[PDB]
Amino acid sequence: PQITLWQRPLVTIKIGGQLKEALLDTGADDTVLEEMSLPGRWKPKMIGGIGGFIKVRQYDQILIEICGHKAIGTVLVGPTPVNIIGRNLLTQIGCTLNF
Amino acid sequence: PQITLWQRPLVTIKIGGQLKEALLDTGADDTVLEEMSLPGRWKPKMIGGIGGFIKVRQYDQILIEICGHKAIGTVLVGPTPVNIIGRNLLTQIGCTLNF
């Protein structure tokens, strides 16, 4: 689809049999999901944002469907108030910025 | 133009007669640039993101050119790790996400 930016670009994603809301963020190198338990081992990691860093758990090879479009990659899980889909996943669905 | 996301979407902007690199960020509600003096009265403001809140200076009705497109709006200036063009100005230039 085409998504205007009048409001935050929040769309529906699906992880497992769970549907969630997530912000399409061209300003995120990574994908950060809200705290959830995923099976598998992870690696601790520190990601920075506008105000500093937060600690997250890194899981590799997670499948997320974005508006019916599948992407597989690294996801970081931390205490974020909103799911953020970053560039690692957006490139996979052929998402571009156009003006 | 159509911007792909294999790399950070950095573009050249012109503001205050200066050229600068900035990120087209759909995950940002506001536009935040690194410390710089701009003409006009500014007022203190706090904005937050991952890691915390930062103190910034708010300048209203600043003219900024993004890839040849003129935008006149609010620009926040403060300790941001990168120059960010948020939704407030991306809408003025007709920017959308597509996939």
Ligand SMILES: CC(=O)N[C@H](C(=O)N[C@@H](Cc1ccccc1)[C@@H](O)CN(CC1CCCCC1)NC(=O)[C@@H](NC(C)=O)C(C)C)C(C)C
């Ligand atoms: C290194 C990196 O890519 N960091 C991302 C990031 O924070 N991206 C920021 C912009 C950015 C890039 C590089 C360094 C520092 C900052 C942005 O795209 C997303 N954040 C996310 C906030 C937004 C609100 C929901 C919770 C997450 N946006 C902001 O920090 C903006 N805040 C708001 C409220 O819009 C701010 C720039 C105005 C994380 C989400 C992984």
